[PDB]
Amino acid sequence: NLAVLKLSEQGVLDKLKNKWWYDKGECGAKDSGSKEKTSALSLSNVAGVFYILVGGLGLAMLVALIEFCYKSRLFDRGVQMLLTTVGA
């Protein structure tokens, strides 16, 4: 009872805890958590941009296909008043 309080008073417990937990920082993140790498951009980062780019092409081509479909074969100034009165 009188002995453990001496070791608590003089920091010997702190020294032992440091020795057997903190001086043996070995695995990964404790050591390498405070370092820095710059970059190198790979394709896995930028992929949805290409996906959007390709999908927009097919959408645009599909639009002109049905444009040529319709012009191979608003309405009633008048009922525009109906449209705007129901819209209001």
Binding site: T38, S39, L41, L53, L59, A60, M61, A64
Partner: protein, 231 residues
């Protein structure tokens, strides 16, 4: 002082401006360029109904897409609906990549220096990976035996508990051992030896950290002879 093997740094080559995008991205941006321009051609010259009314073609389109990619403007714009709705996609496509390009080139043009490993010998007490030794029958090896600073005490503990011998017999022995250990065995010597080994070929060694103490070389005489005061 502490001598280690100098890690071989990389030099920027000739084409060191194509660095912040990899070659996969560089070929995909070439492919998609051709694809977008030929789609814009296809949708433009499609018999709208008269025919020579619109101004686009394969050639106009090939440099329109380039002039939209690099921000230099154009001479003409798509007027048809599907031409506009395909041009806006390319407008969005450039704003992500070229921005990434400049914002990352600002990251390559800040730093080139390596992160400098096991400096100031405290991690030499901490880690168990890279070994280290001194010269046998040496004042430094005696200094770590008699030293009472706790980090030096743990260093002496690791040096006396060694499998195999971390100690060497002559200086060039430890020199060759560090030249072949590939960063797995450090070495302790004196700073004049250290800078002399640095100033020779093949320059593959390196001094890290600062010093540790202040020793000094002197002239030694037997105790009591008459040469002492004239020397």
């Amino acid at each position: 002082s502490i001598m280690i093997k100098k890690p071989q740094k990389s030099k920027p080559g000739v084409f060191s401006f194509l660095d912040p995008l990899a070659y996969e991205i560089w070929m995909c941006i070439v492919f998609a360029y051709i694809g977008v321009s030929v789609v814009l051609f296809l949708v433009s010259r499609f018999s709208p109904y008269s025919e020579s009314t619109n101004e686009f073609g394969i050639f106009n389109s090939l440099w329109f897409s380039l002039g939209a990619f690099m921000q230099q403007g154009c001479d003409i714009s798509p007027r048809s609906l599907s031409g506009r709705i395909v041009g806006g996609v390319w407008w969005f496509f450039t704003l992500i990549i070229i921005s990434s390009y400049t914002a990352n080139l600002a990251a390559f043009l800040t730093v080139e220096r390596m992160v400098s490993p096991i400096e100031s010998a405290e991690d030499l007490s901490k880690q168990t990976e890279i070994a280290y030794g001194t010269l046998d029958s040496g004042s430094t090896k005696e200094f770590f035996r008699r030293s009472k600073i706790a980090v030096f005490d743990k260093m002496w503990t690791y040096m006396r508990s060694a499998e195999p011998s971390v100690f060497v017999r002559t200086t060039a022995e430890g020199v060759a051992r560090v030249r072949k250990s590939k960063g797995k065995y450090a070495y302790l010597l004196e700073s004049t030896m250290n800078e002399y080994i640095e100033q020779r070929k093949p320059c593959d060694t390196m001094k890290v950290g600062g010093n540790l103490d202040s020793k000094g070389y002197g002239i030694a005489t037997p105790k009591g002879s008459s040469l002492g005061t004239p020397v």
